Each structure stands twice: as structure tokens, then as C-alpha cells.
């Protein structure tokens, strides 16, 4: 697929669509690509999304492939800003800094011999496992299972 | 909340519900809990789901709560019709597609921040780009 | 030109279009770009196409040009996946393995000195030379000229 | 196929047919045959075309074939003759000298195991890959894909 | 944005549009992208334009985004009418006027700050003083 | 030209003219001159502009000049202030400090043998290249080209 905007909904009372515009490929790794939500107050607080596909070297004739594997990594960074003062004096506006950065990192290990069905299974089922009542209780409510 | 069955839909043409029964906490680590789908051929191929919540000790602006959700879907080898000796081998695992997701949530982060990161990452796994990368194995250009 | 799908016709009775989706630039070498035909049986057997442009470091003031040269390499790989038969030692069918790989490699050496007309000439005339009755007889029917 | 003239069109505004008369097999290597375009200014600048078929020694009884391979190499050389200017040291105009040589080299690796369909596929699809808009942009306009 | 032709006007009596076709990213550095004006005599004299955007890695109040715009306008030597041997030399570059501009933009800097620095520097290159220094080679006294 | 005020327009909705009064030559380098926009809240936040012309030593009789070069450097500094509190208590006003400094540095390398036409070309065309839609997308919108 081509590089396009990626739109993801907020978790507010009335959800707000955040649009991640593609920034481009990573400077140092050609296998990871970067989108950015530039709606925040300064770039220090912009939210970032990165997707990475790592393919193995092409198979050789007669080579045994049951150990070659493909990796996919999705990563989201949502830095939160803070400000030292909330007003503006004599044209000097408050300049926010980063306060903390919640983030998430997901990695799929897909062995090259796997079926399209296996890949659809692992993708759908993991994405669903992130939305189970237990997952919500652990990530949002910070309560383990007893 | 108390641990109970976790039901997750298949990705077949007609989806099939897989029910992960709670097995219990990991003997080595009390922070990670295991559910298991026992519908497969033999227990070596049972699908597994682990959820882990690591809270820092009660007490310093670098204190972060971690949450790890992991899904393993091992695929067993099909029953053999013939071997060199005539005795069928033990059930063996052919390959294992798996997934590992980790949330890093600073202790200062508000409930709104946590809801945001969870919803938005889960959605980021279902984008057209994510589906092209994981299912069709295509990069973005 | 922005990277896009490359569609090339088969050589069957009724030609079948193969669509090569870009994978992207080689992480090991940035001067070579990769498209992949995902219509095969499993990824190890996906056909691939690679195009490489190697331009020399820019000319310097008073420098001598008469040896600086540009290279372009187009390569196509069409690996044929092995078809499984009954495995008798373990009764476990083997991982998908590549049986053999028919491939082609074309390299243009274009000296920087050369004119656009020279480059158009060499490209067109070589691409035609690959379609001559003699080339067809050598590659397809394995016959020399006498 | 008996050796005969090979006629290939130019890339000019009005294409001009170049006729390559066979010179014959290379005396040093019998598996490579040579045609020559004699329309240039003097023989040193005659364009040349070479086709090579390397078939392996015949399969032997009980021998293993899985590595034996056939190679076909088509090569085109279009040397550009230097245009003379006034010689000032001796006042004697120089012998015809080749200024630079744009050239192209294509090698097909066809494993003996491969079927006629495989060979037709690789030949047609590579010859087409040399005519894609991307190949035209790289060879003629010196632009990569991004 | 996707890369496309960049058209820049000459400084002739009647200006002439030079069209810089995108060549692509630099093989050595993925952060710098190259356009090329191919209207000159031979490729050694093609005019070039490079734009580079260096973002710091996602993660500390000394984190700065850099942007470098560079223009090269090499001037080739004219075709020779006579040499010592009678063979004309390969196209050679006589001299190269060039320009290099670098923006240092702290990550805390707001869109207004970035618009200010870009507009104001670009204007600073067109002041009467700048024109006297670059074109007429005169200092201010 | 004489040292005079330099007036440059803001990028606000309704642009505001900033007037850079000449401060004078640099203390340590006699080849770089300094203007300053003193409209800001305290000198820590004043905006500065510097122009530098570096000429080579005069040519010697019979000396070959194809390596001597002239450099011109224009530099703009726009520090942004921040304040700890926005009101005044008991006659104590808030005193701002510097928060961050966006800046820009441009260097022309003009070989001494270059024509007035070459210099006008490089000046105009670079100044224009700073205002292209791509330059605006990269500096203001922080998006690379893909
Ligand atoms: Ca692109």
C-alpha cells in the first residue's frame, strides 16, 4: 500500500479523530516507516506511529525454510506535555515541555511457512485480546486477575 | 476482576469462537496470568494467552506500570501415515506464530491517557497498512 | 518516478498478468529497489524484481570525467517451489523448499559523458535484442547459431 | 536457426534501422556468436552484438541433475567514436579512437530442470521489465524510485 | 508530501524556468533528498538541489530538528576547438557556485516560530545589503 | 552600502515589521556585521541578524586564480522567552528567561572567477528554493518527501 494518512479515534467522551500524516521512512532503518499526529501544542508533544516489516533474505534452492521468520512491529508514542504557567505576559507565551510518555509496542512473529489463515488468525485474535474486559481492567484500571 | 473464560473470534470464512479457559498464574512470575484454548489436537498445540500487570512498589518520576498481552498459536504437525519404523511419532509442533504487546504507562498518566493509548494502539493494529504488513507481507513505499 | 506496482505478462497460452508490489529499497544497499509477485504458493517462492541505479559521486571542479560511469542493473528471479511427495522417514511433510531458480540479470554501463540519445539507443536496442528470433531460440529452445 | 542479419531499430526521432551482419563465432570461445553493425564512421566504432549459449555436458546414467544449469548471455556494445579537433603538438590528426562505450549485458540462468514454460516466462517477463516506465526513468533520465 | 518537480526561475534578463526533476533519496543518508536540473550540456554540469530533514528519535530539552537546503550550480567548460593531441577532453567542471542553508529548530518551538524563522531568513537573503554582498561583493561600513 | 536599518516582515496573520538596527561589527571578526531587533521584552529575547563577507587575499602577478573563493554568510537568531509567572506582585515584575532559540544559517560559496550572472543566479535561485512548497512543508509542517 502507499503511504497515506492513518486516522485513529480518541478515547474521549466524544471521541476525537487524530490524523497521523506520514513523515516517511526511518533515517537509519529502511524497514520502519513513520506517521505523526501534529495536532499537539509543539512537536515535543506530537504523537507518533511506526510500522516495521522485517523479511528474511530470499530462500536458496534446496534450502530448508522451517526456521526463517518474518517480524512486524507496530509502535505508538503519546507524549503528554506540561506548562510552568498558564497565561501570557508582555507577549511571552508559555512554552510547554514533555512531562511523561506513555507508549505501546506490539511485535508479531510470523514464521515464513505460515498460512494466510494463520496470519489472519494471529492478527485478529491478538487485536481482540487487547480489548478484552481483562485487558481493559489491567491497562486502564490497573487491576490484576486474582 | 476475577478470572474467567476469554472468548476470541477466529479469522475463518465463517469465524469460530475460541474459548481460552483460565489456567492460572505463572509459577515463576505472580504478575502474569495464563488462559488456554484446549480445543486443539493434543496439549502441545493448545493456544495460549498471557496477560501481565507489573506495578511498581508502593512509595520517583521514573516509575512506570507495564502491561504485556501475549498470544501464542502453535500449529501441530498432521498425523503421520507412515514412518521408517512403523511407530507414529509423538505430537510435535511445526511452527508457532505469536504476538507480544507491551504498554508502558507512567504512574503520573491519567485514566484518559491510558484509555487513549489502549484504544489507539489496538486500532493501529487494524489499519489497512497493518493488515497489508502482517497478512500480505507488504511494506509502505 | 514514485514506486508503484509493476505488471508484467506471463508466457502462458493465455498470458496471465503478474503484479509486482514494491517491497522497497534493500536495507543492505539503498541503491537497489525491490518489487515482489505474491501470487505464488508460499512466500519462499514469491517472484521478485530488482532495479539498481548507481550514480557516481558528483563531478568536482577541474576533475577529469573520462572514466566516471553510471550503472543500472535490472534483475528478475522466478523461483519454482518444490512440490511435495510422500515423506517416508518421518511421515512429516517438509517445509516449503525452493526447487530451482530461473533468473536473469541485465547490467547497463552508461558512461556519464554519454548523451541522452546514447542512453535511449542502448536501452531500446538491447531490450529489442532480447526479443530476436535468435535470442528466443537460444533461451527457449537451447539452440545456437551456425 | 541459421545465422542471419539482425535488424534493430534506433531510438531517434525517426527511428533508423541498424543491420547487424553476422561476423561469426568467437575464435577464442565457440559458444558465443557475433554480429556487427557496419554503419559507423570507421571499424573501431562499429556496434556489435553477441549471443552466448552454454549448455552443460550431457546428463549421465544415475547422475544427479539438481545443480546442472544452462546459461544464455546477450550483450550489446555501441561504442561512440571520438570526433577529431585540431591537433597542435604534431599537426597530425589522430587515428580513429573510441571515446566511450555504452554497453549492456543480460544473463539468463536457466536450470536444466526447468520447463519450456519456465524459460518462456523468464525471457518474456525480463524483456518486458526492461521496457517499464521505471526502467526507462533509471536508464534514460537517471532517476531512482522512492 | 510526495516528491515532485521543483521549478525555480533564472536570474537572466528574461528569466528562464529551471525544472529540477526528483532524482530520489541519497544512498548514504535517508534523510536527504535530491532533485536535479538536467537541462545542461552533459550530466557532470547538471544543477542540483538537496533538502534534508533530520528529526531526533522519538522519546531532552536539547533535542533539535535540523533542515538543510543546498543548491549547486556547476558551470562546465566550453567545447574545445583545438587540443594538443586532437582529441577533445571529457566534459569537465570549471567552477561551482553553491549555497547551503541550515535551520536549527528546537523541538519545543511552535509552528509560529518556525514560520517566523523561515520567512524572515528567506527575506534576509533578499535585502539590499544581501544583494550588495553576494552579487556586487561589497561589505557594509 | 552603509550600515542602515534592515526591515523584515513577520509571519503573523497580520504581518508585523521587525526593524533590525545595526549594532556594529563583530568584536572578534572584522568581516561580520550585526543588526538587532530590540523590540522584545529584554535583550535576552532580542532577535539578531549577522552578515559576513570573506574575501581572499589579493591576487599575485601570474598567480593562478581558479581556486580562490569568496564566502558570504547570513545568520538569523530568534530566541523565544518564557516567564515563571504572569502578574506583578508588590511592584516586582516577572523577569523572562530564554526558553529555546530557533535559528538559521546560510552560506554562499562563490568562486572568485564567477560571473555577476552566476552570482545573481545562485542568490535568486537559493532564496527561491527556501520558499518552495516542499521547503515550506519541511520547515513549517515538518514533513519529508516520500
Ligand atoms: Ca513513494
PDB file of C-alpha atoms in Angstrom, chain D residues 19-138:
ATOM      1  CA  UNK D  19      21.546  -4.002 -39.508  1.00  0.00           C
ATOM      2  CA  UNK D  20      23.935  -6.334 -37.644  1.00  0.00           C
ATOM      3  CA  UNK D  21      25.629  -8.657 -40.152  1.00  0.00           C
ATOM      4  CA  UNK D  22      26.975 -11.855 -38.527  1.00  0.00           C
ATOM      5  CA  UNK D  23      30.730 -11.923 -38.100  1.00  0.00           C
ATOM      6  CA  UNK D  24      30.579 -15.471 -36.799  1.00  0.00           C
ATOM      7  CA  UNK D  25      31.599 -17.414 -33.719  1.00  0.00           C
ATOM      8  CA  UNK D  26      34.294 -16.067 -31.439  1.00  0.00           C
ATOM      9  CA  UNK D  27      37.552 -17.883 -32.289  1.00  0.00           C
ATOM     10  CA  UNK D  28      38.504 -17.869 -28.599  1.00  0.00           C
ATOM     11  CA  UNK D  29      35.114 -19.248 -27.415  1.00  0.00           C
ATOM     12  CA  UNK D  30      32.875 -21.256 -29.741  1.00  0.00           C
ATOM     13  CA  UNK D  31      29.769 -20.776 -27.551  1.00  0.00           C
ATOM     14  CA  UNK D  32      29.463 -17.065 -28.329  1.00  0.00           C
ATOM     15  CA  UNK D  33      28.403 -15.637 -31.711  1.00  0.00           C
ATOM     16  CA  UNK D  34      28.939 -12.117 -33.035  1.00  0.00           C
ATOM     17  CA  UNK D  35      27.004  -9.738 -35.287  1.00  0.00           C
ATOM     18  CA  UNK D  36      28.328  -6.286 -36.239  1.00  0.00           C
ATOM     19  CA  UNK D  37      26.704  -3.019 -37.326  1.00  0.00           C
ATOM     20  CA  UNK D  38      28.984  -1.594 -40.016  1.00  0.00           C
ATOM     21  CA  UNK D  39      27.187   1.745 -40.435  1.00  0.00           C
ATOM     22  CA  UNK D  40      29.558   3.710 -38.181  1.00  0.00           C
ATOM     23  CA  UNK D  41      32.408   6.006 -39.183  1.00  0.00           C
ATOM     24  CA  UNK D  42      35.310   3.515 -39.093  1.00  0.00           C
ATOM     25  CA  UNK D  43      35.627  -0.108 -37.949  1.00  0.00           C
ATOM     26  CA  UNK D  44      36.845   0.685 -34.421  1.00  0.00           C
ATOM     27  CA  UNK D  45      33.408   2.249 -33.821  1.00  0.00           C
ATOM     28  CA  UNK D  46      31.246  -0.495 -35.373  1.00  0.00           C
ATOM     29  CA  UNK D  47      28.481  -1.514 -32.979  1.00  0.00           C
ATOM     30  CA  UNK D  48      28.450  -5.182 -32.015  1.00  0.00           C
ATOM     31  CA  UNK D  49      26.006  -7.728 -30.646  1.00  0.00           C
ATOM     32  CA  UNK D  50      26.906 -11.080 -29.061  1.00  0.00           C
ATOM     33  CA  UNK D  51      24.792 -14.086 -28.080  1.00  0.00           C
ATOM     34  CA  UNK D  52      26.124 -16.978 -25.999  1.00  0.00           C
ATOM     35  CA  UNK D  53      24.587 -20.356 -25.170  1.00  0.00           C
ATOM     36  CA  UNK D  54      26.390 -22.534 -22.622  1.00  0.00           C
ATOM     37  CA  UNK D  55      24.738 -25.968 -22.283  1.00  0.00           C
ATOM     38  CA  UNK D  56      26.206 -28.413 -19.768  1.00  0.00           C
ATOM     39  CA  UNK D  57      27.845 -31.707 -20.589  1.00  0.00           C
ATOM     40  CA  UNK D  58      25.159 -34.348 -21.185  1.00  0.00           C
ATOM     41  CA  UNK D  59      23.478 -35.981 -18.212  1.00  0.00           C
ATOM     42  CA  UNK D  60      24.939 -39.363 -17.291  1.00  0.00           C
ATOM     43  CA  UNK D  61      23.160 -42.507 -16.145  1.00  0.00           C
ATOM     44  CA  UNK D  62      22.241 -42.294 -12.475  1.00  0.00           C
ATOM     45  CA  UNK D  63      23.768 -38.807 -12.202  1.00  0.00           C
ATOM     46  CA  UNK D  64      22.150 -36.087 -10.097  1.00  0.00           C
ATOM     47  CA  UNK D  65      20.765 -33.171 -12.093  1.00  0.00           C
ATOM     48  CA  UNK D  66      19.705 -30.753  -9.361  1.00  0.00           C
ATOM     49  CA  UNK D  67      22.662 -28.401  -9.936  1.00  0.00           C
ATOM     50  CA  UNK D  68      23.250 -28.549 -13.704  1.00  0.00           C
ATOM     51  CA  UNK D  69      22.363 -25.276 -15.423  1.00  0.00           C
ATOM     52  CA  UNK D  70      22.224 -23.592 -18.842  1.00  0.00           C
ATOM     53  CA  UNK D  71      23.368 -20.003 -19.348  1.00  0.00           C
ATOM     54  CA  UNK D  72      22.479 -17.531 -22.101  1.00  0.00           C
ATOM     55  CA  UNK D  73      24.236 -14.158 -22.395  1.00  0.00           C
ATOM     56  CA  UNK D  74      23.146 -11.406 -24.790  1.00  0.00           C
ATOM     57  CA  UNK D  75      25.462  -8.400 -24.974  1.00  0.00           C
ATOM     58  CA  UNK D  76      25.295  -5.158 -26.985  1.00  0.00           C
ATOM     59  CA  UNK D  77      28.163  -2.687 -27.450  1.00  0.00           C
ATOM     60  CA  UNK D  78      27.607   0.749 -29.017  1.00  0.00           C
ATOM     61  CA  UNK D  79      30.998   2.487 -28.979  1.00  0.00           C
ATOM     62  CA  UNK D  80      30.972   6.197 -29.822  1.00  0.00           C
ATOM     63  CA  UNK D  81      33.916   7.321 -31.940  1.00  0.00           C
ATOM     64  CA  UNK D  82      35.862  10.375 -30.849  1.00  0.00           C
ATOM     65  CA  UNK D  83      35.368  13.436 -33.062  1.00  0.00           C
ATOM     66  CA  UNK D  84      38.680  14.995 -34.041  1.00  0.00           C
ATOM     67  CA  UNK D  85      39.686  18.567 -33.289  1.00  0.00           C
ATOM     68  CA  UNK D  86      42.821  20.439 -34.305  1.00  0.00           C
ATOM     69  CA  UNK D  87      45.950  18.654 -33.076  1.00  0.00           C
ATOM     70  CA  UNK D  88      48.547  21.219 -32.045  1.00  0.00           C
ATOM     71  CA  UNK D  89      51.642  19.255 -30.994  1.00  0.00           C
ATOM     72  CA  UNK D  90      52.318  17.447 -34.280  1.00  0.00           C
ATOM     73  CA  UNK D  91      49.643  18.840 -36.608  1.00  0.00           C
ATOM     74  CA  UNK D  92      48.844  15.218 -37.491  1.00  0.00           C
ATOM     75  CA  UNK D  93      45.221  14.304 -36.843  1.00  0.00           C
ATOM     76  CA  UNK D  94      44.943  11.260 -34.564  1.00  0.00           C
ATOM     77  CA  UNK D  95      43.993   7.743 -35.533  1.00  0.00           C
ATOM     78  CA  UNK D  96      40.286   6.967 -35.017  1.00  0.00           C
ATOM     79  CA  UNK D  97      39.923   6.383 -31.292  1.00  0.00           C
ATOM     80  CA  UNK D  98      36.948   5.147 -29.294  1.00  0.00           C
ATOM     81  CA  UNK D  99      35.737   7.876 -26.945  1.00  0.00           C
ATOM     82  CA  UNK D 100      33.449   5.852 -24.650  1.00  0.00           C
ATOM     83  CA  UNK D 101      31.294   2.747 -24.823  1.00  0.00           C
ATOM     84  CA  UNK D 102      27.687   2.463 -23.624  1.00  0.00           C
ATOM     85  CA  UNK D 103      27.005  -1.235 -23.263  1.00  0.00           C
ATOM     86  CA  UNK D 104      24.536  -3.762 -21.905  1.00  0.00           C
ATOM     87  CA  UNK D 105      24.909  -7.342 -20.676  1.00  0.00           C
ATOM     88  CA  UNK D 106      21.998  -9.721 -19.962  1.00  0.00           C
ATOM     89  CA  UNK D 107      22.498 -13.204 -18.472  1.00  0.00           C
ATOM     90  CA  UNK D 108      19.763 -15.819 -18.159  1.00  0.00           C
ATOM     91  CA  UNK D 109      20.401 -18.646 -15.700  1.00  0.00           C
ATOM     92  CA  UNK D 110      18.031 -21.454 -16.705  1.00  0.00           C
ATOM     93  CA  UNK D 111      18.438 -24.641 -14.642  1.00  0.00           C
ATOM     94  CA  UNK D 112      18.254 -27.692 -16.899  1.00  0.00           C
ATOM     95  CA  UNK D 113      15.391 -28.996 -14.748  1.00  0.00           C
ATOM     96  CA  UNK D 114      13.240 -26.012 -15.784  1.00  0.00           C
ATOM     97  CA  UNK D 115      10.338 -26.435 -18.200  1.00  0.00           C
ATOM     98  CA  UNK D 116       9.799 -24.730 -21.541  1.00  0.00           C
ATOM     99  CA  UNK D 117       7.065 -22.697 -19.867  1.00  0.00           C
ATOM    100  CA  UNK D 118       9.561 -21.531 -17.228  1.00  0.00           C
ATOM    101  CA  UNK D 119      12.015 -20.433 -19.926  1.00  0.00           C
ATOM    102  CA  UNK D 120       9.344 -18.615 -21.953  1.00  0.00           C
ATOM    103  CA  UNK D 121       8.205 -16.906 -18.730  1.00  0.00           C
ATOM    104  CA  UNK D 122      11.643 -15.654 -17.722  1.00  0.00           C
ATOM    105  CA  UNK D 123      12.540 -14.471 -21.240  1.00  0.00           C
ATOM    106  CA  UNK D 124       9.281 -12.612 -21.919  1.00  0.00           C
ATOM    107  CA  UNK D 125       8.977 -11.118 -18.446  1.00  0.00           C
ATOM    108  CA  UNK D 126      12.549  -9.839 -18.262  1.00  0.00           C
ATOM    109  CA  UNK D 127      12.411  -8.404 -21.799  1.00  0.00           C
ATOM    110  CA  UNK D 128       9.272  -6.585 -20.674  1.00  0.00           C
ATOM    111  CA  UNK D 129      10.840  -5.469 -17.377  1.00  0.00           C
ATOM    112  CA  UNK D 130      13.445  -3.624 -19.437  1.00  0.00           C
ATOM    113  CA  UNK D 131      10.638  -1.538 -21.013  1.00  0.00           C
ATOM    114  CA  UNK D 132       8.803  -0.467 -17.839  1.00  0.00           C
ATOM    115  CA  UNK D 133       8.431   3.237 -17.084  1.00  0.00           C
ATOM    116  CA  UNK D 134      10.708   2.699 -14.076  1.00  0.00           C
ATOM    117  CA  UNK D 135      13.454   1.136 -16.210  1.00  0.00           C
ATOM    118  CA  UNK D 136      13.099   3.957 -18.745  1.00  0.00           C
ATOM    119  CA  UNK D 137      13.399   6.548 -15.972  1.00  0.00           C
ATOM    120  CA  UNK D 138      16.501   4.905 -14.475  1.00  0.00           C
TER     121      UNK D 138
END
